[PDB]
Amino acid sequence: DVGTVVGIDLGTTYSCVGVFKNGRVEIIANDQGNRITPSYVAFTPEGERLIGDAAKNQLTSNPENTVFDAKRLIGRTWNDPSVQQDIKFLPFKVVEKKTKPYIQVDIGGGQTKTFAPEEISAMVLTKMKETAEAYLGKKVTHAVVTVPAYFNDAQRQATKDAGTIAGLNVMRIINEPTAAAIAYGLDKREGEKNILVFDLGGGTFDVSLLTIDNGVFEVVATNGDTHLGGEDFDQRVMEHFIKLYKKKTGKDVRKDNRAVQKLRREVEKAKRALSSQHQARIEIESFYEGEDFSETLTRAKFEELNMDLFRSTMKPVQKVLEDSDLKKSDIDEIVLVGGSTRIPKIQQLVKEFFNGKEPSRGINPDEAVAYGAAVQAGVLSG
Ligand SMILES: Nc1ncnc2c1nc(N)n2[C@@H]1O[C@H](CO)[C@@H](O)[C@H]1O
Known part of the structure; x- marks a missing residue:
């Protein structure tokens, strides 16, 4: 018994949770009335653990003990050059422990504690689980969790591990651009189609070229900018x-x-x-x-x-087309993901790059990934 399976977009800056209820996807608002939750954890001097909006809306008074961007460190080794570059820009301490970049914070009154990046992500996942549980009026044990298409084996396993610590059996790890495509019903199309997913989040920019054939998705090429x-x-x-x-x-x-x-x-x-x-x-x-x-x-x-x-943002779109041996006219569907895609200049730039082609529309771009995850969660809940 999997119960009501939840769909979770576990983002770098924000996370989103959806469920399939009474024949449709429901995106669940947290205790602060928000349909998106910051992927933030804070440990106050009194020793209170804050997760989400409370953690982020306190970050200025506590920069050392406010953890965010754990997604940049999850499933990576301490000496990974990406880790070594990223920790230069993070205000909290990151130490080598068991080959991994552990986050070190004062959890209250000078008491120091270290957390693996998956332990921080487990706290974000716990907050998402509570948000869904408050909404459903019952316990949640299973989830579909999305990850970027570029996530490797260690990054996907560490995301599943974050789930385990949070008490979530992560049944499926699905790619974020694939979830966005499912949200738009691009899975139930016919024949071979090329999908360009343009994902401009709060701190990351991801471009993915996907192919859909007989309902099966394949990630052909990925690009973007990790710090845009x-x-x-x-x-x-x-x-x-x-x-x-x-x-x-x-x-x-x-x-x-x-x-x-x-x-x-x-x-x-x-x-x-x-x-x-x-x-x-x-x-x-x-x-x-x-x-x-x-x-x-x-x-x-x-x-x-x-x-x-x-x-x-147009340069990684050109690089994915070249790495996929496709041209602009070969793109059948344009999917915009992330709140930043609501920027009118961004929408004009994408449309003009694809010589006037209109992107898919209807779903909030900041919720499309959790929406897609919830669609899959709906099938698994049966
Ligand atoms: N309506 C909007 N116009 C411009 N930016 C918007 C936006 N909505 C969001 N979420 N965003 C941005 O999305 C990112 C992640 O939430 C943040 O940088 C938001 O400001």
């Missing part, structure tokens, strides 16, 4: 306003960490608003040295601030 995502677009806007504030007031905002967090929160909200509105206003009370911040951002300035980054 929505957060980089935020950072460009942060830089623009920190520069502007120094020009206007002569003050250096970054001297106050509390002032940068506040600007980060408002910049992110402004960015999201600019996907639908042509201008957003950032207002922050007692911003720096009791003085208030009031500035506006147009979609045009935002696009100009991020143009090189937006344009850089």
Whole structure:
């Protein structure tokens, strides 16, 4: 008895959980009313373990003991050059333990603890499991968990292990671009089709070329940029306003960490608003040295601030087409994945690259992967 199997998108920055109930996929909101949960864990000085929104919305006061991006370390050895590069940019301690990059944190009152990346991901998975259990009114024991198509054997096993620690029997490990394609019903098509999945997440950019033949998916080629995502677009806007504030007031905002967090929160909200509105206003009370911040951002300035980054997304799309021996016209379906794909310039750039071809539409791009996982979870629940 597998019970109600859950579909989990375990993302670098955000995670999503869905179930198949009363003939359809249900994406489940967490205890904070959010349909996506940050892949964050924080250990407060009192010793409280925070997971998700509570962990992320506290990150500024606790940078050493706030764990995130464990997905960059999962199933990798300590000496992996990717690990050695990534830990340079992580604020929490990472130590070699049992050949692996273990995360070291103060769990409260100076007591130090080490966690394998799969133990951190198990805490995120536990939060997803609780979110689904609150929704279903019953215990969840089985799951379908997605991973990037480039994940190797050790990375897929470590994701299954994270599940085991969380009390989830991960029945199927499925590729994130395949789950997105299933979400759009591209599996029940007929004949041979080439699917381009363009996945621009919060911190990663993944491009996958998939082939669908008689309902069977094959990942032909993968590319992207491991350090390009929505957060980089935020950072460009942060830089623009920190520069502007120094020009206007002569003050250096970054001297106050509390002032940068506040600007980060408002910049992110402004960015999201600019996907639908042509201008957003950032207002922050007692911003720096009791003085208030009031500035506006147009979609045009935002696009100009991020143009090189937006344009850089087209290079891995060209590399996957070459590595698949395909041309632009051979792409039958374009799947956009990640909240960042809601950016109008990103949607124009993809459409124009594929000479006017419209991408698949209807499912929230930030939920498409968990949606696909839930579709598969639905079949397995029977
Ligand atoms: N409507 C939107 N417009 C622009 N960016 C959006 C967005 N929605 C999300 N989630 N995002 C970004 O997706 C990433 C992961 O959640 C983050 O960088 C979000 O800001």
